[PDB]
Ligand binder design. Sequence first.
Ligand SMILES: Nc1ncnc2c1ncn2[C@@H]1O[C@H](COP(=O)(O)OP(=O)(O)OP(=O)(O)O)[C@@H](O)[C@H]1O
Lengths: 138, 310
Amino acid sequence: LHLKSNWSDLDKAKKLLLAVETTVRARVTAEVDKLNICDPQVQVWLRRVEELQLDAIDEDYSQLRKYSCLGQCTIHAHRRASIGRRVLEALDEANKLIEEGRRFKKFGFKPLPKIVDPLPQIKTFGLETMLSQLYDLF
Amino acid sequence: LHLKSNWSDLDKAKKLLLAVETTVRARVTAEVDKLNICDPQVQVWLRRVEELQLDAIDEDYSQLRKYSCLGQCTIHAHRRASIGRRVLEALDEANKLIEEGRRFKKFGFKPLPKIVDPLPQIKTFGLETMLSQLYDLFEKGDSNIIGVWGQGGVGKTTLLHVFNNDLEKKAHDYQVVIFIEVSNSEALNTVEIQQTISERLNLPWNDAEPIAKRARFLIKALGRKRFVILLDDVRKKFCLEDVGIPTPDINSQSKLILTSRYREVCFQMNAQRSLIEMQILGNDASWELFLSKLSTETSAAVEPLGSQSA
Ligand SMILES: Nc1ncnc2c1ncn2[C@@H]1O[C@H](COP(=O)(O)OP(=O)(O)OP(=O)(O)O)[C@@H](O)[C@H]1O
């Protein structure tokens, strides 16, 4: 019976993937604090991690466990194939994401300097006319 | 007969796994002592080690050893398959945990700086009214710069400490609260302030970076965060952009709180309309504070009521 072992491996992979995602997010947040934009590859990896949605197969396996009351009954044995393929797909996808996740070394890059750098914006009075004149000559 | 050899290998793996877990836990404890949070991967590994529960198969094999009286009898030979699979599963799982356990090199990481940094919480008396007033201007106030003035040593620093410590009770949208002690000099020692702000924002401090470039860097850094900076006892007018603090505007949710001994310098900070005068404590508050600084051998000589003594 490989289904239970594979689902347990999926549980371990899910926990370890949560740990890896937490570490990566912490590093990316540290880079962001330094005025740096997140690395595009790391952003794609984060998107794939967020879109994994292991909760769906978790609830699906729970629903099957509701009917896992008799192994002998086969009325519900048809959906075992769906679980058997989806759990394996989630497992090897998670393994690929883990192997990629552990490998990043850079997590950000300095963005190109902005077109305009903000300056102090102290409240002004009656400067509209001369500002318009400056725009006119500019 | 591979069962006995496999169980002996499981025993060796269990002992070596206990040793590995002890070493890893020692390293994690050392990292924790350094204010560092445990590495999530190491935490998951520790959880799996704790959830291994080799004692269960140990007792199960002992129960089988009670019936291990005859190899030939099939009465208990049925459970040999269960032992044969569970022992192997425990063995190769333990081997995987060992190979992973030996490989970690980092065991912790510096956590993100807290929303509020704790400050001394010396016991206060009769500060509730002015604390409520400070909250009123901090929340309702339409001006992002709040100025407080009063006589020297009337609790301005104490009010800032208690207010900053009380901010963690209430919920707010302010990510970072910064406490700055400007009264260290009248020459505006900018390096210490920049280091404090950089430390509070998890920024990597640099030694050879010029002051003006750092000021621009912090101005950009504070430009995306709703911050609450607490200047303490400012004594001369100084440009906020010079040190790196952006002057908050109505379009931003950041609030600036400063204290001073002089009304004029507070007026110079464009905080003329978030001004509160620090009134001295009342007679009842002064009396209840006075007892807190007296020994009972003296206090029990003064505290009791009813009987009147000089
Ligand atoms: N409500 C209070 N209850 C108890 N102690 C208080 C209270 N208010 C102030 N203090 C005491 O005042 C002492 C001096 O700090 P305080 O906050 O009064 O100074 P300050 O007004 O900031 O002074 P300065 O003008 O020199 O900067 C502290 O040691 C503190 O114990």
